[PDB]
C-alpha cells in the first residue's frame, strides 16, 4: 500500500493558532525532538487583506463580495449556535481562523493581558499570577506592540470627567464602587491630562492596575522602514520564511521541525490507553497516517478541541455510542462542557452644537488605534448583588469600556432608531462584560469527519418564571438566572452617569456643546436612574412584577421600564469571539494539562483555561502554550530567557 | 441543490482559474457556469385581527391535524393587474404567481411579535401568506476548500436590493 | 571544484520578456529538447502593485516612496541616455522590466498590432504581412483582451467631428490627407455613433483598417469571477503555477523545462565560432557555468542585447579592443546600431461653460480603459514633404491619437503655463509619432559585468546650420534634418483643426460649451494655421530664416512663430518606452534570425525588428518569438494550432 508520506515522529502538534506556533517554535528551539505541525491551511504572508492591518475593515474587498474575513469560508470556520432562547431564538455564527496563526490572522489586534486578581482567585494551584506573569512578559516582548500615534481632546474630556466623579467615589466610604482600586489608595488611578503627562501602562508587570482610566491600548502592529504598517501575529513571528522553508522544513537551528500546510485531521488512532497515530486528509482527498512515539498535542481552538476528542473516543459513552462511535476509550461526561465568552451591549451618543466638528476631530481609525480611543476598565457597580466574597478586600475587573466614532449598532437597529451612519455628530460607547455569566456546551453530531457546525448551545438572556413557592426562598435562583441582564442594565447606568461630568468638563474646557444618550432612548434612561436611586439594593425585585406585590403605579412604572429596557441588550449588542473553557483545568485536564484517563495527550489552547481572563483573550492562549513548552520539556528554559532575545522578523 | 455543484467543483468541473486559485490539483472541464443560477421561493407574512365578543365560534376547527398540518386553503392566484414585470404570453396564457395560505395563530418571528404588541397567547388572530412562486433574485454557489465536503460553502443570495439613481437622463434608466 | 549546479543542456533562452516566455513555453510544448530559461528576477504573482492593473497608477505606494515601477530599481533596469543635443541636453531614463514577463509586468497594457502596410513595405522577404498575421492572431487569442466597459459622450462628439471633416477630405481629390483609407473607398472609415452601432476592430485579421476612428482600445486585463480585474501578461500566461513548479521545473507535459529566477548573465563562453557555454551570477555572488549543446537564444531586450553581444566578442574589433575586451570573435561594425523609438508631444484643451461637468462625465480611468478614450489613427498630413513613394497608392499610419481627462504635461510646464491639475475643465490630446525619424546607437563602456547604463546616444530635435553653399542643392539635407520637428508641428495643426468641428458638433448635440487649445497658446496656433494656409507646401522654408531671403515683416512673423513653436515639442512632451531595432534583420541578423558570423546563436526580441510597427510594440515582440519557435523547430506547429487551444490560467 505505497504511501511514501511516512511522517512518523515523537511529538505532533495539531492546530497552529495563537498557541500552536509558540509551542512548536520554542519546542524545536530548545531540544532535538522531531516535531510535526498540522494546520490545514496555507500561509497568507502575501495577501494584502491580511498583512495590511487596515484590510480588516474591508479595503481590498471586491465590490461583489463585500464580506470580511470572519464571514468568509475560505478564511475561517463557520460554526453556528443553536437558537438562543434568550435572544428571540436568533442563531449566530462566530468564527475561528483557518491559516497559520489561527484567529490572530483575522482579529482586531488588542493586548489586554487580564487583571492580576483573576489568576489569583479563579485558577488552580500552580496557575496563580506570580507563576505566569513572566510568561505574559515573554509574549508581549515577543510581539512588541505600540501605542496610539494621535492625540484627541475627547479622550482628555472623558478622562477629566471620570477623575471628577472618582473623586466622590473615593469618599463616601462605600467599598465596592467601579472606580476604586485598592493597590493605589486614596488617589484615583486616572491618567493625567496635559502635555508631558506620563502614560499609565495597562499591562504592567506587577499587576497594580486592575482599575484604571487611560488613553490608549496596545495593538499588535509594527511600522516598516518605508512608512507602512503591517500585522504582527503568531504565524508572522514564530513561523516565517527565516525559520521554515517553503517546503515546510525548518532551517538549521530548527532543522528538526516539520509543518504541513493543508492537512485536516480527523481523529487520533489510539492503541490501548496509548495514543499511537494520527490521520489527516490532504488536498487530493487522501488519508495519510503518521506515527506518534512520545506525545500528542491538541491546539485546535475552543470549538474544535472537544469535537476531535469526542470523535477520538473520550466523552460520554452513552451519547457517542448513540450517534455511532465504534471505538470508546474513556468515559468523561464533562468533555465539551463549560463554554464561556464575553458580550458587549452597545450605546451611542448625540452631540448638539453648530460647530461640533471641532469637538470630534482626530477620531478616525489608523493602524495604530484601530478606532479605539480608550477609555478604561471598571469594577463592580455599587448595586450588583452577584459579587464574590473577596469584593470587600480585592478589586475585580468587570467592565471594559471603549469609545469609538460613528455608529456601531446593527443595520436594522439603525433604521429602527431613526439615526444613520451618514451624519457626523454621533459616537459609540461600549460596556463589555468580562465576567459574563452564561455557560454552554458542545456536542458532535456525526462520527464521520470534522464538521464545520457541531451542536453548540449558548443561552444568554433567559427569563425567570415564578412558581407557587413562597417568595422567601425562591429569590436566590432568580438572582442566578437574572445575573447577566442585571449586569447589562448596570453597565447602561454606569455609562449614563458619565455624560454629566462630561457636560461640565466640556463647558469649562472651551466647548459650548451638549452630550446626550439617544440609544437607548433618553427618557428610558432617566427613568432607570430615578428608579435605581429611589429603590436601592432591592431595585432588581421588579424584573418579576408578580412577586414584588407592589401594585402602586410607581411600581408598575418601574416594571414596565425594566421590561422595555430588557429588549435593547438582546438585539442591540454584539456577541464577541472570545470562546474559551471547553476542556478546562480540573473539569477535563489536570494542572499539568494532561487529559484525564490517558498518559500521552494534552490540550493547550484557550479551551483549557479554567476562567476567562480580564480582557481580550489572545495573550492568554499564547501564555498557555508557552507554559506548556516548559511542562513538556521538563525544566524551565523559556522561563528566564533574557527579554532581549526575540525572534527575527521577515 | 447546495451540494451537487460543490462535489462537481471538487471533482474538477467548473471555473479553472478559481479552482486553481483555491488549490484544486486536477482539472477536467472548464465550465464557468457550474453552481450558477440558484433559485428559491419566498413568503412574506401578514396576520388578521378579529373583533367580537364570541368570535371563538368563528375560529373553531382550525387546529392542526396530521391531515391538514395547519393548512386551510385557500387558492393559487395569478399576476396582479398593476405589475409591470409580466411575460409576453400574459395576454393569452394565465401564469401562477402567488400561492395563498391561511393558518390559525400568529407566525411572524418572535422579535416582530414583541415589536408589534401582539402575541401568540391570545386567540382572536390568524395568519395569511402570499408566497412568491416566480421569485426573481438569483444567486450562486462556490466551494471554499478542496479538502473534504464542508457543511457551509460560499452561497450568495441577495433579495430586496435597492436602486441608486445616476446622472443619466430619466428616460432610459427606468428599465433597470 | 565542487559546483553541483550542472545545468548543461541543448537550448538556453536568456531573458524572459515579452518574447522569452512565449518561446520557452511553445518550445517545450512541441518537442523533447531540454530547455533552460535565465531571467535574473523573481515572480511577482502576489504583488498587489503588479497584479492589480490599477496599481500602475500608484495605488499601493508607501507615502514616503511615491514612485512607480518604471522608476524603481528593484523592478526595472534604469539606463540613462547621453545628453540629447536636440532637447537642451536633457538626459532621460527609460526602463526595461526586471521580472518574469519583462516590460509586460510594468507596462500600460495596450494592443495595437500595427498596420498591414508596414510589414509589406518595410520588412524583408518572408516577413511580409501575409506571412505573420496568423502569428498575431495566435498571440491575441492567447491573451484575449477586452474593450472599454463604459460609454461617454465626448467620444461620440469627437468621432462626429472627425467624420464631418473626413467628408470634405474624401472630396477635393487630394490623395494623401490623414483621413483617407484606400481599402474602403468613398465612405469614411469612422465608427457610427448611436445605440446599436457596431464596433470597428482596430486589430482586424485582414488588415483593412490602417486609418480608422473608433471608440475603444484592447487592454490586456481579465475579469475574475469575484468582480476584480487582474493583469494578463507574458509571465502570467505562459509561465504560471500550473505549468512550472515553485522550484523551477515544468509539470508533466513540460517536464523538460528549467527556469532559474535570479541569475544575471554576463557573456557567452565561445569556443571557435561555436558557442559552448554561458555563465551567470546567482544571489550569493557566485559564477555558475552551464554547457550548451545545440543553440543559444538572446531575448534580453533592446538595450541589453547588443551589450551582451559586445561583451561576448561580436562588434567593432577596434573599439572592443580599445576598452579592453580580451577575446574577439566576429568583426561586425553594425552591432548596436539603428536604435528606434516613438515620441508623443502633448497638448491640452480648455472648456468654458457653467455646467461643463455634464460634458466631461464618465472619463475617469477604470481597469478596462486605463484612461484611454480613443480616438483614432491617422495618416500623413497633406503638407509633409517626407513621404515615401507609395503614398499615392497605399495609406501609411503616421499618428496615433489619444484623448484623456486631466492634464498630462510635466510639473514644471504645469507651473509655467498657469494651469494645474486641481481644476476640472481641462483635458489632454496626444498625437504620437509612429514613424519617428531620429536614429541612435548603443555602446558598452566596461568589459567586466552587465552594467545598468551603457553609452546610449539619441538626438531628436536637432537644428540645421546653413553653409555658404548655394541654396539650390542644400535644401535636401535640411529636409532630412528637420523631418521630426516638421512632423510634430503638423501633428499640432491636425489636432487644432479638429476642435472647430467639435464646436459645431457640441453646439448641435445638446451642449452650449466652448472648446479651445490653451497649451500651446491660442494665438501661437492661430498664427501657425494662417501661415500654413498662406504659404502652402513651402511653409517649411522658414525654419531657417537666412535662406528664405523673405525680409517682409510677414516672413519675420512666420520665422518668429516657428521659432517659438519649436520650443514646445522639446520640453512639453514624453519620450515613449518602445525601444527597438538594435540588431535588425540584415544589419546584424539574417531573415532566419541567426547572427552573422556564427552558426548557433539567434536574437529574437524586439531588437531584431527591422522597423518599428504601427503602434505599441508589445504584440510585435511576442510575434517574433512565436515565429522563432517555428524556425528553430523546423516545421510549422504553432502555425495552425487551432485558435480554441489556449493556455490555462492560474
Ligand atoms: C472576529 C474575531 C475577533 C477577535 N478579536 C480579538 C480582540 O479584539 N482581541 C484579542 O485579543 N483577540 C481577538 N481575537 C482572537 C481570539 O480572541 C483569540 O486569539 C483566539 O482564542 C486564539 O486562540 P487559539 O489559538 O486557541 O484559537 P485559534 O487561533 O482558532 O486556533 C485554532 C487553530 O487550529 C486550526 N484547526 C482547527 N480545527 C482543526 C482541525 N480539525 N485540523 C487541523 N487544524 C485545525 C485552525 O485552523 C487554527 O489555525 C479575535 C478573533 C476573531 C475570530
Ligand atoms: C514604461 C513602459 C510603458 C510601456 N507601455 C506600453 C504600451 O503602452 N503598449 C505596449 O504595447 N507596450 C508597452 N510597453 C512594453 C514595451 O513596449 C514592450 O513590451 C517591450 O519591448 C517588451 O519587449 P521585450 O520582451 O523584447 O523586452 P523585455 O520585456 O524588457 O525583455 C527583457 C527581459 O530580459 C531580462 N534581462 C535583461 N538583461 C538581462 C541580463 N543581462 N540577464 C538576464 N536577463 C536579462 C529582463 O529582466 C527582461 O525580463 C511599455 C513598457 C514600459 C517599460
Beta strand C92-93 with A601-603: parallel, antiparallel or unpaired? unpaired
User: CA C621, CA C607: separation in Å to the nearest integer?
Assistant: 9
d(CA C632, CA A578): 64
SS3 C393: coil
> How is residue A419 written as a grid cell?
439615526
Contacts of A603 (CB under 8 A, 6+ apart): A297, A298, A299, A305, A309, A583, A588, A589, A593, A595
Q: What does the H/E/C string look like for C615-629?
A: CCCCHHHHHHHHHHH
Q: Which residue is closest to A283 within chain B, CA to CA?
A: B147
| Residue C226 to chain A, least CA–CA distance (Å) | 6
Q: Are A581 and A328 in contact (CB under 8 A)?
A: no
- Measured CA to CA, the distance from residue A559 to residue A543 in angstroms comes to 6
- For A283, the closest of B146, B151, B154 (CB atoms) is B146
DSSP per position, A587-647: TTB-TT-BBTT-SSEEE-SGGG-SS--SS-TTHHHHHHHHHHHHHHHSS-SSTT--TT---
Query: Distance (Å, rounded) from C-alpha C314 to C-alpha C300?
Result: 16
Alpha-carbon distance B25 to A284, whole Å? Answer: 7
Active site residue C611: no
Cα A428 to Cα A217, A359, A403, A407, A568: the distances in Å are 17, 15, 6, 6, 15
Calpha distance C158→C372 (Å, rounded): 14
Cell 412604572 -> residue = A557
- Residue A486: in which H helix or E strand, if any? helix A475-496
**Is omega for the bond preceding A168 within 30 degrees of 0, making it cis?**
no
Domain match, C531 and C422 both: yes
**Grid cell 486631466 — which residue?**
C406
CA triple C116-C117-C120, angle to 5 deg: 95
C576, C605, C629 — which closes off a domain?
C576
Q: For residues C428 and C465, what is the distance between their CA atoms, to the nearest angstrom? A: 34
Give the largest CA-CA distance in chain B. Answer: 72
Nearest protein CA to atom 39 of ligand 1, as residue: A300
Residue ranges making up the domain that contains A71: 1-147+218-341+436-458+577-650
DSSP, collapsed to helix, strand or coil, labels residue A515 as: strand
Three-class SS state of C267: strand
Q: Which ligand is in closest contact with the Cα of C114?
A: 2
Ligand 2 atom closest to Cα of C41?
A: 47
Torsion of CA A189, A190, A195, A201, to 10 degrees: 60
* In contact, C137 and C276? CB cutoff 8 Å: no
Measured between alpha carbons, how far is C108 from C359 in angstroms, rounded to an integer? 26
Question: Residues 6 or more apart from A47 whose CB is under 8 A from it?
Answer: A55
Whether B18 and C358 lie within 8 Å, measured CB to CB: no
What is the C-alpha to C-alpha distance for residues A142 and A628, in angstroms, rounded to an integer?
A: 17
**Resolution of the PDB structure in angstroms:** 3.7
Alpha helix positions (H), C497-648:
499-507, 522-535, 545-548, 553-565, 568-571, 619-633
Q: Residue A124 C-alpha to ligand 1 middle, in angstroms?
A: 24
Alpha-carbon distance A486 to A528, whole Å?
12
Q: Are residues A539 and A482 in the same domain?
A: yes
Question: For residue A137, how far is the Cα from the chain centroid?
Answer: 19
Cell, residue A246: 517553503
Residues from chain B contacting residue C242 (CB–CB below 8 Å):
20
Give CA–CA dist C313/C325, Å, rounded: 7
C358: nearest CA partner in chain B: B167
What is the rounded distance in angstroms from the CA atom of residue C377 to the CA atom of residue C108?
18
For A530-539, which contacts have Cβ atoms below 8 Å and span 24 or more sequence positions?
A531/A557, A531/A558, A531/A561, A531/A562, A532/A383, A532/A493, A536/A383, A537/A383, A537/A385, A539/A383
List all residues 6 or more positions away from A592 whose beta carbon is below 8 Å from its beta carbon: A631
Tell if the CB–CB gap between C242 and B20 is shorter than 8 Å.
Answer: yes
- Write phi, then psi, for C255 (nearest 5 degrees): -65, -20
Q: A97: annotated binding-site residue?
A: yes
List of chain C residues whose C-beta atoms are within 8 Å of the C-beta of residue A63: 227
Phi (first) and psi of residue C217, to 5 degrees: -100, -170
Cα A479–Cα A484–Cα A486 angle in degrees, nearest 5 = 70
DSSP calls for C291-346: EEEEEEEE--HHHHHHHHHHHHTEE-HHHHHHHT-----EE-TTTTEEEB--EEEE
| Under 8 Å between Cβ of A243 and A25 | yes
- Name the phi and psi angles at A156, rounded to 5: -65, -45
Closest CA to A155 of A427, A403, A352: A403
C505: its cell numbers: 458638433
Distance CA C570, CA C563 (A): 12
Which residue in the block uniquely carries the three cell numbers 561594425? C333
**CA pair distance C595, C273, nearest whole angstrom:** 11
How far is residue A294 from each of residues A10, A19, A604, C81, measured CA to CA in Å? 4, 20, 16, 67
Angle at A457 between CA A447 and CA A327, to 5 degrees: 20
Nearest protein CA to atom 2 of ligand 1, as residue:
A107
In Å, how far from its chain's centre is CA C182?
26
DSSP states of chain B: --SHHHHHHHHTEE-HHHHHHHT-----EE-TTTTEEE---B--EEEEE---TTGGGTS-S-S--TTTTT----EEE---TT-S---GGGGTS----EEEEEEES--S-HHHHHHHT--SSSSSEEEEEEEESS----EEEE---SSS--S--EEE---S------SS-GGGTTT-
Domain end marker among C545, C561, C576: C576
Set of cell numbers at residue C414: 504645469
Residues C547 and C571 sit within 8 Å (Cβ to Cβ): no
Distance CA B59, CA B65 (A): 15
All residues at 6 or more sequence positions from C350 whose CB lies less than 8 Å from its CB, including other chains: C419, C425, C426, C515, C516, C517, C518
Measuring CA to CA, how many Å separate B65 from each of B46, B61, B68, B72, B124?
23, 10, 6, 11, 20
A327 and A361 in a single domain? The answer is no
10 Å Cβ neighbour count for C130? 11
Residues 6+ apart with CB under 8 A from C283: C262
Determine whether the annotation assigns residue A265 to a binding site. Answer: yes
Q: For atom 38 of ligand 1, which residue has the closest CA?
A: A300
Atom of ligand 2 at shortest range from CA of C450: 41
Looking at the fold, whether C294 and C245 belong to one and the same domain comes out as yes
- Cα–Cα distance measured from residue C468 to residue A115, given in angstroms and rounded to the nearest whole number: 98
For this PDB entry, the determination method is cryo-EM
User: In terms of domains, do C158 and C225 share one?
Assistant: no
At A493 the three-state DSSP class reads helix
CA distance C128 to C133: 9
> Are C51 and C154 members of one domain?
no
CA distance C72 to C41: 14
SS3 content of chain C, % helix, strand, coil (to 5): 30, 20, 50
Ligand 2 atom closest to the Cα of residue C578 is 17
Can you tell me whether residue A506 is helix, strand or coil? helix
Which phi and psi (to 5°) does residue C54 adopt? -70, -15
How many whole angstroms separate alpha carbon A484 and alpha carbon A472? 22
The C-alpha atoms of residue C583 and residue C593 are separated, in whole angstroms, by 10
Taking each helix axis as running N to C, give the angle between helix A475-496 and helix A553-565, from 0 to 180 degrees, rounded to the nearest 10: 80
Q: Is there a single domain that holds both residue C22 and residue C114?
A: yes
Q: What are the grid coordinates assigned to A87, written together?
A: 435572544
Using CB atoms, which chains have 3+ pairs under 8 A with C? A, B
Cα–Cα distance, C272 to C635 (Å, whole number): 29
Q: Where are the alpha helices (DSSP H) in A144-217?
A: 153-170
**Closest Cα partner for C301 from C102, C101, C447?**
C102
Which residues sit opposite A77 in a β-bridge?
A96
Ligand 2 pocket member C264 (CB < 6 A): yes
HSE-CB at C630 with a 13 A cutoff on CA atoms is: 18
Residues of chain B with Cβ-Cβ distance to C356 below 8 Å are none
How many domains does chain A fold into?
Answer: 2
The single-letter DSSP state of residue C83 is: P
Distance CA C110, CA C369 (A): 9
Give the residue, by CA position, lying nearest to ligand 1 atom 48: A102
C-alpha C516/C-alpha A37 separation (Å) is 69
Q: For cell 455543484, name the residue.
A: B5
- State the best of A87, A281, A285 to mutate against chain B, taking most chain B CBs within 10 Å: A285
Shared domain check, A2 and A58: yes
Q: Give dist(CA A352, CA C28) in Å, integer.
A: 73
Rounded Cα–Cα distance for residues C515 and C426 (Å): 10
In contact, C562 and C489? CB cutoff 8 Å: yes
C372 shares a domain with C448: no
Task: Give the dihedral of Cα atoms A73, A75, A81, A87; nearest 10 deg.
Answer: -100
Considering the domain architecture, whether residues A291 and A329 belong to the same structural domain is answered as yes
d(CA A115, ligand 2 centre) in Å: 60
In DSSP terms, which residues pair with C35 in a beta bridge?
Answer: C11, C257
| CB C181 near ligand 2, within 6 Å | no
In angstroms, the CA C642 to CA B167 distance is 46
**CA-to-CA distance for C41 and C265, rounded, in angstroms?**
12
Quick one: C380 and C247 in the same domain? no
Burial of residue B152 (number of CB atoms within 10 Å: 0-12, 13-18, 19+): middle
Q: What is the dihedral of CA A384, A390, A393, A394, to 10 degrees?
A: -80
Nearest to C595 by CA among C338, C334, C341: C334
Interval between CA C173 and ligand 2 midpoint (Å): 43
d(C-alpha C551, C-alpha C566), whole Å: 21
Inter-residue contact A251 to A120 (CB < 8 Å):
no
Please list, in sequence order, all residues whose beta carbon lies within 8 angstroms of the beta carbon of residue C507, skipping any fewer than 6 positions away: none
Are A129 and A207 a contacting pair, CB within 8 Å?
yes
DSSP sequence for A301-332:
HHHHHHHHHHHHTEE-HHHHHHHT-----EE-
Chains that touch B (3 or more CB pairs under 8 A): A, C
Task: Give the distance, in angstroms, between the CA of residue C266 and the centroid of all CA atoms in the same chain.
Answer: 27
CA gyration radius for chain C?
Answer: 25
C619 in the same domain as C571: no
**B167-176 long-range contacts, Cβ below 8 Å, gap at least 24?**
B167/C358, B167/C361
Identify whether the C-beta of residue B47 lies closer than 8 Å to the C-beta of residue B126.
Answer: yes
The full length of chain C comes to 650
Q: Which residue has the cell 490555462?
A: C648
User: CA torsion angle for C73, C76, C79, C80 (degrees, to 10)?
Assistant: -70
Provide the β-strand partners of residue A288. A280
Residue C60 near chain A (CB below 8 Å)? yes
* DSSP three-state, residue C279: strand
Q: How far is Cα A638 from Cα C481, in angstroms, rounded to an integer?
A: 79
Q: Is C108 annotated as a binding residue?
A: yes
Provide the CA B152 distance to its chain's centre, in angstroms: 19
| Separation CA B87–CA C431 (nearest Å) | 52
Q: What SS3 class is residue C358?
A: helix
Length of chain B: 176
**Beta carbons of C116 and C183 less than 8 angstroms apart:** no
Sign of the torsion angle spanned by Cα atoms A636, A638, A643, A645: positive
**Interatomic CA distance for residues A216 and A373, integer angstroms:** 6
| Residue where one domain finishes, among candidates C538, C557, C576 | C576
> Whole-angstrom Cα distance, residue A92 to residue A82?
8
Give me the helix-helix angle, A522-535 and A553-565, nearest 10°.
130
Cis bond before residue A520 (omega within 30° of 0): yes
Q: How far is B67 from B71, CA to CA, in rounded Å?
A: 9
Strand partners, C350: C426, C516
Q: Would you call A227 and C62 a contact, using CB atoms and an 8 Å cutoff? A: yes
The secondary structure of C449-482, three-state, reads CCCCCCEEECCCCCCCCCCCCCHHHCHHHHHHHH
Amino acid at each position: 500500500c505505497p504511501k511514501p508520506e511516512n511522517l512518523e515522529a515523537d511529538i505532533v502538534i495539531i492546530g497552529a493558532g495563537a498557541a500552536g506556533c509558540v509551542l512548536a517554535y520554542y519546542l524545536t528551539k530548545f531540544s532535538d525532538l522531531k516535531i510535526i505541525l498540522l494546520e490545514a491551511g496555507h500561509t497568507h504572508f502575501n495577501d494584502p487583506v491580511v498583512t495590511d492591518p487596515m484590510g480588516f475593515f474591508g479595503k481590498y474587498n471586491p465590490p461583489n463580495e463585500n464580506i470580511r474575513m470572519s464571514q468568509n469560508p475560505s478564511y475561517a470556520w463557520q460554526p453556528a449556535l443553536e437558537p438562543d432562547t434568550g435572544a428571540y431564538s436568533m442563531r449566530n455564527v462566530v468564527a475561528h481562523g483557518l491559516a497559520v496563526g489561527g484567529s490572530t490572522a483575522i482579529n482586531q489586534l488588542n493586548y489586554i493581558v487580564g487583571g492580576r486578581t483573576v489568576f489569583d482567585n479563579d485558577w488552580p494551584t500552580g496557575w496563580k499570577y506570580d507563576d505566569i506573569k513572566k510568561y505574559f512578559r515573554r509574549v508581549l516582548a515577543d510581539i512588541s506592540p505600540i501605542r496610539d500615534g494621535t492625540k484627541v481632546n475627547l479622550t482628555n474630556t472623558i478622562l477629566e470627567s471620570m477623575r471628577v466623579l472618582a473623586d466622590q467615589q473615593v469618599s463616601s466610604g462605600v467599598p465596592v464602587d467601579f472606580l476604586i482600586n485598592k493597590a493605589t489608595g486614596g488617589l484615583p488611578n486616572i491618567e493625567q491630562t496635559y502635555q508631558g503627562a506620563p502614560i499609565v501602562n495597562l499591562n504592567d508587570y506587577e499587576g497594580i492596575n486592575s482599575v484604571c482610566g487611560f488613553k490608549s491600548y496596545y495593538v499588535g502592529v509594527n511600522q516598516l522602514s518605508d512608512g507602512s504598517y503591517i500585522r504582527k501575529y503568531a504565524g508572522n513571528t514564530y513561523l516565517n520564511s527565516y525559520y521554515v522553508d517553503s517546503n515546510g522544513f525548518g532551517i538549521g537551528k530548527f532543522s528538526n521541525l516539520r509543518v504541513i500546510s493543508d492537512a485536516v485531521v480527523d481523529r487520533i488512532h489510539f492503541e490501548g490507553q496509548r495514543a499511537v497515530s494520527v490521520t489527516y486528509i490532504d488536498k487530493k482527498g487522501n488519508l495519510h497516517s503518521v506515527k506518534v512515539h512520545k506525545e500528542v498535542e491538541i491546539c485546535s481552538g475552543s470549538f474544535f478541541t472537544p469535537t476531535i476528542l469526542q470523535r477520538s473516543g473520550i466523552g460520554d459513552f452513552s451519547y457517542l455510542s448513540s450517534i455511532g462511535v465504534p471505538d470508546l476509550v474513556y468515559n468523561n461526561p464533562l468533555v465539551g462542557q463549560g463554554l464561556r465568552n464575553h458580550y458587549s451591549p452597545i450605546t451611542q451618543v448625540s452631540v448638539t452644537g453648530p460647530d461640533a466638528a471641532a469637538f470630534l476631530s482626530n477620531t478616525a481609525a489608523g493602524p495604530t488605534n484601530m478606532s479605539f480611543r480608550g477609555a478604561g476598565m471598571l469594577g463592580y457597580h455599587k448595586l450588583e448583588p452577584n459579587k464574590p466574597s473577596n469584593a470587600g478586600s480585592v478589586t475585580y475587573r468587570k467592565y471594559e469600556l471603549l469609545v469609538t466614532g460613528g455608529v456601531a449598532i446593527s443595520a436594522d437597529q439603525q433604521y429602527l432608531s431613526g439615526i444613520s451612519s451618514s451624519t457626523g455628530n454621533y459616537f459609540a460607547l461600549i460596556a463589555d462584560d468580562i465576567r459574563f455569566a452564561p455557560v454552554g456546551y458542545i456536542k458532535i453530531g456525526t462520527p464521520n469527519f470534522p464538521r464545520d457546525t457541531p451542536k453548540i448551545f449558548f443561552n444568554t438572556f433567559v427569563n425567570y418564571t415564578p412558581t407557587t413557592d413562597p417568595a422567601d426562598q425562591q429569590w436566590p435562583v432568580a438572582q442566578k438566572t437574572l445575573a447577566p441582564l442585571i449586569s447589562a442594565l448596570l453597565g447602561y447606568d454606569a455609562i449614563y452617569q458619565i455624560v454629566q461630568q462630561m457636560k461640565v468638563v466640556a463647558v469649562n474646557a472651551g466647548f459650548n456643546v451638549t452630550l446626550q444618550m439617544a440609544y437607548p432612548p433618553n427618557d428610558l434612561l432617566v427613568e432607570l436612574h430615578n428608579g435605581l436611586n429611589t429603590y436601592g439594593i432591592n431595585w432588581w425585585h421588579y424584573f418579576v412584577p408578580s412577586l414584588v406585590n407592589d401594585d402602586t403605579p410607581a411600581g408598575k412604572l418601574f416594571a414596565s421600564t425594566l421590561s422595555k429596557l430588557s429588549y435593547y441588550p438582546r438585539s442591540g449588542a454584539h456577541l464577541d469571539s472570545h470562546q474559551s473553557c471547553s476542556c478546562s483545568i480540573g473539569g477535563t485536564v489536570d494542572t499539568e494539562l494532561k487529559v484525564i484517563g490517558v498518559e500521552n495527550v494534552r490540550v493547550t489552547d484557550l479551551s483549557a483555561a479554567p476562567h476567562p481572563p480580564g480582557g481580550n483573550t489572545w495573550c492568554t492562549a499564547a501564555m498557555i502554550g508557552a507554559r506548556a513548552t516548559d511542562l513538556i520539556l521538563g525544566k524551565p528554559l523559556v522561563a528566564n530567557l533574557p527579554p532581549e532575545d526575540v525572534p527575527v522578523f521577515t
